[PDB]
Amino acid sequence: STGSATTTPIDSLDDAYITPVQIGTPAQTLNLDFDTGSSDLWVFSSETTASEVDGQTIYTPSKSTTAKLLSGATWSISYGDGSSSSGDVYTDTVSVGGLTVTGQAVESAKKVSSSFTEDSTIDGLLGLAFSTLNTVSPTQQKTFFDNAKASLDSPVFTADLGYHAPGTYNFGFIDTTAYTGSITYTAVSTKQGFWEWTSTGYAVGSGTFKSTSIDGIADTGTTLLYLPATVVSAYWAQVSGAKSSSSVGGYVFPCSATLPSFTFGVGSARIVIPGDYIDFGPISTGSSSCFGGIQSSAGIGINIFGDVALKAAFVVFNGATTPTLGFASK
């Protein structure tokens, strides 16, 4: 089997991407944030505290003839941005782009933190990291990809995120029309539960490539590119007037600037992030200070190849017995 679904930016900045997902019988379609940095499929629901729902579409398990309470199971998750959610668990039929999994754990939110409530466009998350990170207790549950894998034509999914435009998540096949050149594959460590790999270096604009190992994670659920402070300083030093602002929370730059590209290495191959992809717009409405799309990871503990980086590539998440990542230009 295969599946193919379009993923759409939630706003004009590509702050996140939403993909329609069918849950239950008859189908209830929710727009979920596909997140290769986490491993829970959770949704706003008829069980979510009413004051914490503000415009989201909810899953109502009592209206699904295939929903079953997973008795005794609870979940609770905290994300790197400080947001969180928790609740109980049903199993139900879940379909993405024509690919169906029966008995998928659907984690129903009883509580969500303010940032989720405040984002009316995201009805929940669909985790695509390794199932060892799944938070369901006392019986850990599998991701949608893990459940589907054995049925897929090939044990892979691909992320093709658009810049200020829709893109595609495919399951079970690699669309050879969706990228240019060849796909370069690179090793993955699953030891932390992530799609963790080592970039071979970087360049700023037209500058020379610096060969240096940068361990990080491919994370569709993180907006920006978070890299070591040395790398990030070298980038922003090429932008007149750019500075790190403690009060804003990162590097800012004059909105009048034209940003240089940023290149990252994948083995001997190179992925070029155009400068425009690094512009996240005014820090507050009407400001002439703009927020940068490349930020320091120094306070995180891990480097994160988030959407800014991934949207410049066609990315293969290869879930073969030994997982690997592939990157192609597009």
Are residue 168 and residue 198 in the same domain, yes or no?
no
Are residue 98 and residue 233 in the same domain, yes or no?
no
| Long-range pairs for 169-173: beta carbons < 8 A, 24 or more residues apart | 169/4, 169/5, 169/7, 169/19, 169/34, 169/96, 169/97, 170/2, 170/3, 170/4, 170/97, 171/2, 171/3, 171/4, 171/96, 171/97, 171/99, 171/145, 172/1, 172/2, 172/3, 172/99, 172/148, 173/2
Residue whose token pair is 């879940």? 94
Q: How far is Cα 216 from Cα 265, in angstroms, rounded to an integer?
A: 12
Q: How many C-alpha atoms does 310 have within 13 Å on its Cβ side?
A: 33
- Strand 167-171 with 84-96, pairing: unpaired
Are residue 160 and residue 180 in the same domain, yes or no?
no
Tokens of 86: 């928790």
Are residue 61 and residue 34 in the same domain, yes or no?
yes
Are residue 114 and residue 209 in the same domain, yes or no?
no
Q: Tell me the backbone φ, ψ of residue 170, rounded to 5 degrees.
A: -115, 145
Closest CA to 242 of 277, 203, 294: 294
Are residue 16 and residue 81 in the same domain, yes or no?
yes
Domain count, the chain: 2
**Alpha-carbon separation of residue 189 from 195, 196, 197, 229, 323 (angstroms):** 7, 5, 6, 23, 8
Are residue 239 and residue 197 in the same domain, yes or no?
yes
In the sheet with 269-273, reading across from the earlier edge strand, the strands are 269-273, 262-266, 196-204, 210-218, 303-305, 225-227, 294-296
Q: How far is Cα 73 from Cα 136, in angstroms, rounded to an integer?
A: 6
Supply the DSSP symbol for 76.
E
Run of H or E residues at 117: helix 114-117
- Strand 184-187 with 167-171, pairing: unpaired
Q: Tell me the backbone φ, ψ of residue 144, rounded to 5 degrees.
A: -55, -45
Print the domain residue range for 134: 5-174
Tokens of 223: 């907006």
Are residue 258 and residue 319 in the same domain, yes or no?
yes
Closest CA to 239 of 214, 260, 218: 260
Q: How far is Cα 31 from Cα 55, in angstroms, rounded to an integer?
A: 12
Are residue 159 and residue 307 in the same domain, yes or no?
no
Are residue 165 and residue 283 in the same domain, yes or no?
no
Q: In the listed set 142, 174, 206, which residue is the last one of a domain according to the structure? A: 174
Active-site residues: which are they?
35, 199
- At 125, the amino acid letter reads L
Coil, helix or strand at residue 210: strand
Tokens of 324: 């690997």
Are residue 151 and residue 192 in the same domain, yes or no?
no
Sign of the CA dihedral running 255, 260, 261, 267: negative
| Strand residue runs (E) in 188-266 | 196-204, 210-218, 225-227, 243-245, 250-254, 262-266
Q: How far is Cα 227 from Cα 216, in angstroms, rounded to an integer?
A: 8
Q: Are 126 and 21 in contact (CB under 8 A)?
A: yes
Count each helix (H run) and each strand (E run) in the chain, helices first: 4, 24
Are residue 189 and residue 326 in the same domain, yes or no?
yes
DSSP for 303-324 reads EEE-HHHHTTSEEEEE-SSS-E
Counted residue by residue, the chain has a size of 330
Q: How far is Cα 110 from Cα 99, in angstroms, rounded to an integer?
A: 28
Closest CA to 31 of 22, 43, 19: 19
Q: What is the CATH number of the domain that holds 109?
A: 2.40.70.10
Coil, helix or strand at residue 114: helix
Q: How far is Cα 137 from Cα 94, in angstroms, rounded to an integer?
A: 21
Q: In the listed set 123, 145, 174, which residue is the last one of a domain according to the structure? A: 174
Q: In the listed set 174, 207, 229, which residue is the last one of a domain according to the structure? A: 174
